Amino acid sequence: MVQSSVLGFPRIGGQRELKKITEAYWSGKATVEELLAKGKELREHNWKLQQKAGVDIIPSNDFSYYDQVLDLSLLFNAIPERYTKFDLAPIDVLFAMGRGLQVDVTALEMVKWFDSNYHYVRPTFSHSTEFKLNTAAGIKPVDEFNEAKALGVQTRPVILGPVSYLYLGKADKDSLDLEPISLLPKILPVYKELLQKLKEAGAEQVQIDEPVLVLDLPEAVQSKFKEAYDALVGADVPELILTTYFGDVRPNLKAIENLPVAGFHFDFVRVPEQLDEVASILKDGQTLSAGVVDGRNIWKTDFAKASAVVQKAIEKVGKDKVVVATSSSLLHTPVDLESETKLDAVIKDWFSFATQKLDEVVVIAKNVSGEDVSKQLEANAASIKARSESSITNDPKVQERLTTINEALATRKAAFPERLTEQKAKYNLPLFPTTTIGSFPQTKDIRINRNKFAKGQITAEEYEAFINKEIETVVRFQEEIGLDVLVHGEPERNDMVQYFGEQLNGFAFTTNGWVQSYGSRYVRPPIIVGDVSRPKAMTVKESVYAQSITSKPMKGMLTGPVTILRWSFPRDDVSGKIQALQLGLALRDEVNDLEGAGITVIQVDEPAIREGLPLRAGKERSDYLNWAAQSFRVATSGVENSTQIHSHFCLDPNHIKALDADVVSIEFSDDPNYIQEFSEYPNHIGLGLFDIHSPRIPSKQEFVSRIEEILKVYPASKFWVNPDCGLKTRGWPEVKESLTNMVEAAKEFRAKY
Ligand SMILES: N[C@@H](CCS)C(=O)O
Ligand SMILES: [Zn+2]
């Protein structure tokens, strides 16, 4: 009998209960007691759900109030002194570290979890760090194991392992020379103790996550797995299942081929081809957990293909030593497809969310164990077959237009220096031209009118009028502040990816398909279901209106192809690359419509352009850098030489050059040397002058200072002046003075040239 296994379950709740209750606690509507009661109920609910599906190996310690890496830092005493000064309970210390503390500590750094859309809180270590088991609050992994046990649910605790925990961490402000991995000897006894306590509590297996194995690791780091796991493994601890996901462990195979652990987990959804070699290093007695149900996407699994993968593993190591698993934690997928009320049934039949993936690992497990599941297999085969044959997936026009992609389509009529000549003639911008990034802060009357417009209570014309008033206000604001290259404020836009996805063929949307991004901030990504195309103008009306009321140049504002791809659920039947190129072609028609309508300054926002960087150096990485840049160039390369193309980012120098934008903005407000990278590079650059997440106002002199610093490493002829990013999240008085000061700073320099 082949067991089924779930590496972690999303914890936000089927109706976002975690968000409401944690925000109610932070706001003061709810007590901490209510907070913990509600966590307990979610955990219990998710455990019963997995037991009822028939999952054998069910996780615990996967729950978190904020972030599981942060939970380990609390638990192991990786707590910087700055967070202890305020008579705080452990759970408020956790929230302090996680989200800062309004008396003003900054939150610890949030960092992207590999190439997932989740963010963790970076473990932060000092020379003074003293690792130990904080048993004050309770020991969360032991307490949550015992809870699940009292329900009659045996679970497998999940903890991030010592190597990855340290390696993914950073030396604190006060210890810039400390190498985190050098702490391995201090933290090992603390892991050992925790594992003893879990065994004592009744844990027979522990899932110990070592995802850094899918990265490029120094040889000196690779040797530490043998050191860590020789120390951890013994009779007085649970069996350890060393767990990896998101990538290829093969280059690091030497580091794990002689480890005393009870088994391994590998991701055969991202890297099925690694199976033969990883299977071959299993010792007699070791188990192989085969990750064949994707933890990061929303597509119904192909039961025949998944079973085949599992069957290849059984061949190599025997049926008794194989486990059917989710490829990673289901943290990265929405909770329940059954909550969806709007999707057409044909499309929904192609999806499985977290709750459904429980059923998938169970059926696949039954199948290779020899139980009769033909009805499920045939139902699955039909879903897969309907999807591959649907006209939605295969658009002939789009397929042909892909055949036109070549380097000529991704090259502008002339190089920057010629282009600059024609742009100077046409716009005659001053030195130190000033701009902003696009968004300005919205009114109450806006959201209310959107809602009314969605209900048909005001007409299309009435709503248009309200948007244009907002645009009018914003433009007049910018004029009077003396900005040089204006924006329309994006008041019509909810979201920089959904706004576009809704207007493209090939996308579907959910009502409830929420995934945690960080803390209590959740996203509901679009889904790319098929071939993408643009049926009509998406942004032209608003931009034409904005330009029609000022003589300043107005930026069109688009989100680039790679950002749209990376912030959506992608298709799994075609490559990232093909999806980006189709998006680039679709955006090229929009650029063409803008330019044709007189919007001849156009910004393409690519904040996530690097987020898909393949996790290892090699062919796949260099291909990615090439196609990401090509897909941007395909969108922007059909314009006239005098059309000024901008790009915004928030980051490899040379990748940025390969985009060949006339003008760049880059989140900044930080070593000077980085800027010296662009000195003999002709295109123009605006390095963000202020943090838009703060309400604080820099002085004129502040700005003058900041500019003069950059100016020592970068010529005045190329320098734009702008904020790090949009201003959608700020208040109007912060905005007014900050932009005033920014621009009068600029003019002071303008005058001395
Ligand atoms: N144009 C967008 C950029 C966000 S990355 C804005 O100003 O908000
Ligand atoms: Zn931005």
Q: What is the residue-wise DSSP string for 161-222?
A: -HHHHHHT-EE-GGGTT--GGGGHHHHHHHHHHHHHHHHHHT--EEEEE-GGGGS---HHHH
> Whole-angstrom Cα distance, residue 664 to residue 685?
5
The CB-side HSE value for 84 (13 A sphere, CA atoms) comes to 6
Residue 671 to residue 109: CA distance in whole angstroms? 18
List, edge to edge, every strand of the sheet that includes 555-559.
555-559, 601-605, 644-649, 663-666, 684-687
Residue 280, SS3 per DSSP: helix
Paired residues of 57 in beta bridges: 5
Cβ–Cβ contacts within 10 Å for residue 743, how many? Answer: 21
In contact, 531 and 457? CB cutoff 8 Å: no
Q: Do 170 and 208 sit in the same domain of this protein?
A: yes
Which secondary-structure segment (H or E) carries 277? Answer: helix 275-280
149 vs 45, 141, 203, 274, 528, CA distance in Å? Answer: 14, 12, 10, 36, 40
What does the alpha-carbon distance between residue 633 and residue 627 come to, in Å, rounded to a whole number? 9
Alpha-carbon Rg for the chain, nearest whole angstrom, is: 27
Going by C-beta distance under 8 Å and a sequence separation of 6 or more, which residues neighbour residue 468? Answer: 545
Catalytically annotated residue among 332, 488, 684, 693: 693
Q: How many CB atoms lie within 10 A of CB 615?
A: 18
Residue 266: φ, ψ to 5°: -130, 155
d(CA 423, CA 50): 62
Bridge partners, residue 556, by sequence: 602
Tell me: do 344 and 482 sit in the same domain: no
Shared-domain flag, residues 537 and 675: yes
Going from the C-alpha of 641 to that of each of 84, 485, 551, the distances in angstroms are 58, 18, 21
Query: For residues 635 and 591, is the Cβ–Cβ distance under 8 A?
Result: yes
- Closest-CA residue, ligand 1 atom 8, reads 726
Which one, of 485, 478, 386, lies nearest residue 440 by Cα?
478
* Closest residue by Cα to residue 323 from 298, 354, 286, 295: 286
Look up residue 608 and give its amino acid: A
Query: Residue 485: beta bridge partners?
Result: 435
Query: H or E stretch including 69?
Result: helix 68-76
Task: Mark which of 525, 551, 585 sits at the end of a domain.
Answer: 525
- Cα(689) to centroid(ligand 2), Å: 13
The residues with which 59 forms a beta bridge, in sequence order, are 156
Positive/negative CA dihedral, 504, 508, 512, 513: negative
Pocket test for ligand 1, best of 440, 474, 488, 496 (most atoms within 8 A of CB): 496
CA 488 – CA 555 distance, rounded (Å): 8
The reply to whether 6 and 149 lie within a common domain is: yes
**CA 313 → CA 28, 73, 244, 282, distances in Å?**
52, 36, 16, 11
- By CB atoms closer than 10 A (0-12, 13-18, 19+), residue 573 is middle
Ligand 1: residue whose CA is nearest its atom 6: 726
**Residue that has been written with the tokens 């969360």 in this structure:** 140
Which ligand is nearest the CA of 691, by number? 2
Give residue 663's Cα distance to chain centre.
Answer: 26
Could you identify the residue written with the tokens 């000077």?
A: 672
**What residue type is assigned to position 704 of the chain?**
V
Q: Which of 364, 402, 397 is nearest to 380 (CA)?
A: 364
Feature table: binding site for L-homocysteine: 437-439, 490, 605
Give the atom of ligand 1 at the shortest distance from the alpha carbon of 557.
1
Question: Cα–Cα–Cα angle for 704, 707, 712, nearest 5°?
Answer: 125
520 with 572, same domain: the answer is: no
Phi, psi of 627 (to 5 degrees): -70, -25
Chain centroid, CA 247 distance in Å: 16
Query: In 260-301, at which residue ranges do the beta strands (DSSP E only) sit?
Result: 263-267, 287-293
Instruction: Enumerate residues 6+ apart whose C-beta is below 8 A from 646.
Output: 555, 601, 602, 603, 604, 661, 662, 663, 664, 665
How distant is the alpha carbon of residue 732 from its chain centre? 29
* 624, 497: one domain: yes
Distance CA 500, CA 490 (A): 13
| Beta-ladder partners of 49 | none
Atom of ligand 1 nearest to the CA of 603: 1
* Ligand number nearest to the C-alpha of 435: 1
Indicate which CATH number applies to the domain containing 238: 3.20.20.210
**Of the candidates 234, 205, 191, 722, the residue with the CA atom closest to the CA atom of residue 434:** 722
Considering 466, 494, 525, which residue would you say is the last residue of a domain? 525
Q: Among 648, 664, 693, name the best residue to mutate to test ligand 1's pocket (greatest count of ligand atoms within 8 A of Cβ).
A: 648
Give yes or no: residues 473 and 518 share one domain: no
Q: 3-class DSSP state for residue 272?
A: helix
- Closest by alpha carbon to 296, among 516, 502, 120? 516
Residue 607 has φ and ψ, to the nearest 5°, of -60, -25
663 phi, psi to nearest 5 deg: -145, 140
Residue 161 CB contacts under 8 Å (≥ 6 apart), including other chains: 191, 208, 209, 210, 228, 242
Q: Which atom of ligand 1 is nearest to the CA of 438?
A: 7
Nearest CA to ligand 1 atom 5: 607
CA dist., res. 544 & res. 135, Å (int): 62
**DSSP secondary structure letters along 393-438:** T--HHHHHHHHT--TTTTS-SS-HHHHHHHHHHHH-PPSS-BB--S
Contacts of 43 (CB under 8 A, 6+ apart): 11, 60, 63, 144, 147, 148
Whole-number Å distance between alpha carbons of 422 and 427: 9
| 451, amino acid identity | N
Residue 437 CA, closest ligand 1 atom number: 7
- Tokens at 326, concatenated: 């989710």
- Residue to substitute in 439, 488, 563 for testing ligand 1 pocket (most ligand atoms within 8 angstroms of CB): 439
Distance 567 CA to ligand 2 centre (A): 14
Q: What angle (nearest 5°) sits at the alpha carbon of residue 632, between those of residues 630 and 634?
A: 70
Collapsing DSSP states into helix, strand and coil, what is residue 296? coil
Residue identified by tokens 């490559």 is 575
Q: Are 285 and 264 in contact (CB under 8 A)?
A: no
Considering every ligand atom, which ligand is closest to the CA of 491? 1
Which residues does a 6 A CB cutoff place in the pocket of ligand 1? 437-439, 496, 557, 605, 607, 648, 650, 725-726, 728
Q: How far apart are CA 223 and CA 219, in angstroms?
A: 6
Distance between CA atoms of 234 and 212, rounded to whole angstroms? 24
DSSP states along 450-499: HHHHHTTSS-HHHHHHHHHHHHHHHHHHHHHTT-SBB--B-TT-S-TTHH
Contact of 488 with 475, CB cutoff 8 Å: yes
d(CA 690, CA 672): 16
The CA distances from residue 597 to 81, 539, 552, in Å, are 58, 11, 16
How much distance in Å is there from the Cα of 490 to the middle of ligand 1?
9
Angle at alpha carbon of residue 12, lines to 7 and 16, rounded to 5°: 150
Torsion over CA: 633, 433, 494, 691 (sign): positive
Ligand nearest to the CA of 439: 1
| Closest protein CA for atom 1 of ligand 1 | 438
**Count of residues for the chain?**
753
Phi, psi of 590 (to 5 degrees): -70, -45
CA dist., res. 391 & res. 465, Å (int): 38
Beta-sheet pairing, 527-533 with 505-508? antiparallel
Is 140 strand, coil or helix? Answer: helix
Query: Ligand 2: distance of its center to the CA of 489 in Å?
Result: 13
Residue nearest to atom 4 of ligand 1 (CA): 726
Domain span at 623: 390-510+526-753
The reply to whether 515 and 609 lie within a common domain is no
* Span from the CA of 75 to the centroid of ligand 2 (angstroms): 35
Alpha-carbon gap, residue 388 to 394, rounded angstroms = 8
Q: By three-state DSSP, how is residue 324 classified? A: strand
Dist CA 192 CA 199 (whole Å) = 11
Is 278 found in the same domain as 354?
yes
8 Å CB contact between 649 and 604 = no
Q: How far is the CA of 602 from the centre of ligand 1 (A)?
A: 13
Angstrom CA distances, 724 to 505, 562, 704, 714, stand at 32, 20, 16, 18
DSSP track, 542-575: HHHHHHHT-SS-BEEEEE-HHHHHHTSBPPSSS-
Residue ranges of the binding site for Zn(2+): 648, 650, 667, 725
Beta strand 644-649 with 663-666 is parallel
Looking at the CA of 650, name the nearest ligand.
2
Ligand 1 pocket, mutate which of 435, 436, 437 (most atoms under 8 A from CB): 437
* 746, amino acid identity: A
* Statement to judge: residues 376 and 485 lie in one domain: no
307-313 long-range contacts, CB within 8 A, separation 24+: 307/364, 307/367, 307/368, 309/268, 309/272, 309/275, 310/2, 310/364, 310/368, 311/368, 312/275, 312/276, 312/279, 313/275, 313/279, 313/288
523: phi then psi, degrees, rounded to nearest 5: -115, 155
Q: Chain centroid to CA 546: how far?
A: 32
User: Please, what's the largest Cα pairwise distance for the chain?
Assistant: 83
CA 657 – CA 677 distance, rounded (Å): 11
Alpha-carbon distance 669 to 694, whole Å?
12
Residue with tokens 């002689």: 258
Contacts of residue 647, Cβ cutoff 8 Å, sequence gap at least 6: 560, 603, 604, 605, 606, 632, 656, 659, 661, 663, 664, 665
Could you give the CA distance from residue 392 to residue 389 in angstroms, rounded to a whole number? 8
The span from the CA of 290 to the CA of 278, in Å, is: 11
Cα angle for residues 401, 405, 409 (degrees, 5° grid): 115
| Same domain (yes/no): 419, 481 | yes
Number of domains in the chain: 2
> Which residues belong to the annotated binding site?
19, 117, 437-439, 490, 495, 518, 521-522, 567, 605, 648, 650, 667, 725
Cα of 560 from ligand 1 centre, angstroms: 11
Beta-bridged to residue 719, according to DSSP, are 685
Q: How far apart are CA 544 and CA 138, in angstroms?
A: 60
What is the CB-side half-sphere exposure of residue 91 using CA atoms within 13 A?
15
Name the strand (E) or helix (H) holding 515. strand 515-518
* DSSP assignment letter at 122: P
Helix, strand or coil, per DSSP, at residue 111: strand
Q: Is-contact 715 753, C-beta < 8 A?
A: no
First to last CA, the chain: 80
| Tokens read off for 216 | 């490029």
Q: Which of 525, 557, 572 is the last residue of a domain?
A: 525
CA 648 – ligand 2 centroid, Å: 6
Same domain, 336 and 350: yes
| Helix, strand or coil, per DSSP, at residue 10 | coil
Told to judge if 646 belongs to the known catalytic residues of this protein, a careful annotator would answer no
**In sequence order, which ranges of 599-652 are alpha helices (DSSP H)?**
619-636
